[PDB]
Amino acid sequence: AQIGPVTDLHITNANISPDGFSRPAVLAGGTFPGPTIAGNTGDNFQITVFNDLTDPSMLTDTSIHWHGLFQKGTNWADGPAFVTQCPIITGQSFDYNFNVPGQAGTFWYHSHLSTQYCDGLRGPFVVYDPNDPNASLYDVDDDTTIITLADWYHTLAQQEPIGAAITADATLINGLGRSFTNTTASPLSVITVQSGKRYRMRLVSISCDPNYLFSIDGHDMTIIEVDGVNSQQLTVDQIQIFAAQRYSFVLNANQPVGNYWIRAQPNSGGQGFDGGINSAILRYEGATVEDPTTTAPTTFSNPLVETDLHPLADLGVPGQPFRGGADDPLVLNLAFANGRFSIDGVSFVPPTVPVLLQILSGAQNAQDLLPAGSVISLPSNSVIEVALPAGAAGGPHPFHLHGHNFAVVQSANNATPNYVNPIWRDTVSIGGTGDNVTIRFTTNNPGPWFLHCHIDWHLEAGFAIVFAEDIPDTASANPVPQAWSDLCPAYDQAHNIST
Ligand SMILES: *[C@@H]1O[C@H](CO)[C@@H](O[C@@H]2O[C@H](CO)[C@@H](O[C@@H]3O[C@H](CO)[C@@H](O)[C@H](O)[C@@H]3O)[C@H](O)[C@H]2NC(C)=O)[C@H](O)[C@H]1NC(C)=O
Ligand SMILES: *[C@@H]1O[C@H](CO)[C@@H](O[C@@H]2O[C@H](CO)[C@@H](O[C@@H]3O[C@H](CO)[C@@H](O)[C@H](O)[C@@H]3O)[C@H](O)[C@H]2NC(C)=O)[C@H](O)[C@H]1NC(C)=O
Ligand SMILES: [Cu+2]
Ligand SMILES: [Cu+2]
Ligand SMILES: [Cu+2]
Ligand SMILES: [Cu+2]
Ligand code: NA
Asked: What's the domain of life for this entry (predicted)?
């Protein structure tokens, strides 16, 4: 069952074996992935998060981010530790109480403390639209049509060297999959469809690192949503999905009744499908209960290319149709050396006082804010352009901005910008050497918004900056509840920190 929009959510430790290997984890709702949190557009969500964690090897503190939800007027509820809150300590709870005006689509939630979400705290978050403009394109859209793609590690996250190339041990599709080494024939996930029906498959990358080449043997996929943004219909036979991205696609159950492989090939870790790694099963009602015998093609003839996507609505692009054609045009210098990432020469290390609390205490320019050199102020009611030229080791890096979606004016592997009708999204691959992926948005949401690579190991190694958007209006725009004001005293007391 789905839970929400008003619900408790318990965060616990437990042993799980999603690939046949047992390890302890950090779980929401007792499962991996966590339960789907759902509601309708414009609803009030009140997710009362109970931190019941006791195993220090995966951290006993926590904080949860609602990925892709703008949090306008509720920056305090966004979740990134030491940006918008101090962590929730064990034995305490915290009500994330916010609204989702003007958004409908496929989202997710995850820990936003250190690398904790890799240890299991990740789940889907769906905001349905009772008047969805895409409703007539499918018959079925429910918890059974959500498809999660996850990397899974046998080593606990707090034992992964910082700045290292860290590699997974299994791909999990809907929480199940087989290990790349010492492979055992553990259960594969089954997605069941009825011949002749059309399904809104909600594809969610809950990855900590790899991107996946996703396909379904014998089927194609008609994209209708990208990171919460409705798209024109685009039919593809493969989707390369980077960490934290989402797509909705229509699956037409129009092939013979039978069993078909669902494939998710990561860019690192196990290659291919030997022993049923990187796999799940599409089963038609009435098919024999047996593994598929289908083949992938050698090459995919209609892969997704990001510049082929266009919004369903006339969203346009803010600003002027040339590089630098914005009120506040930025170019970030994105680098890696010696185990640490940097942005504009500064490696991110979380501050002791959350950025939002520094601003509410009266710090009002970005040079007064800690960490020094990690906070960039943005002016209010202005067009922002951010160029993100690639080249730093460990790519391709999927960059994500909190508080906002953005027009993708220039995509990976294509030097041509689009100032007319690019897709809007919230997490974008910045590509390869010599690329100049560029985003634009307008500043109508006061508060400190994280910008970072969504490969969680990279964030931990410093690949982040904070956009302090409209510092002067942050306090009036974001009134804070007493329970939020209580978090930093409680946290600092528990950890013997003075501030
Ligand atoms: C990606 O696109 C951005 C624009 O969105 C390019 O930024 C431009 O970069 C050049 C330097 O590479 C800048 O010109 C330089 O400016 C300094 C003065 O600040 C001057 O001392 C240098 O002689 C040179 O003129 C320019 O200001 C900047 N912005 C623009 C053109 O709008 C960036 O180079 C592109 N990166 C890649 C890898 O393609
Ligand atoms: C590289 O990225 C550029 C920019 O996003 C892509 O260029 C765009 O290509 C589209 C598709 O061909 C062009 O739209 C077409 O316009 C024609 C002529 O008006 C119209 O008859 C078609 O109905 C269609 O809309 C679009 O104008 C063009 N934009 C720019 C700024 O060049 C390009 O396709 C990408 N390259 C690859 C290999 O995908
Ligand atoms: Cu996220
Ligand atoms: Cu986010
Ligand atoms: Cu990265
Ligand atoms: Cu983040
Ligand atoms: Na425009």
From this structure: Eukaryota
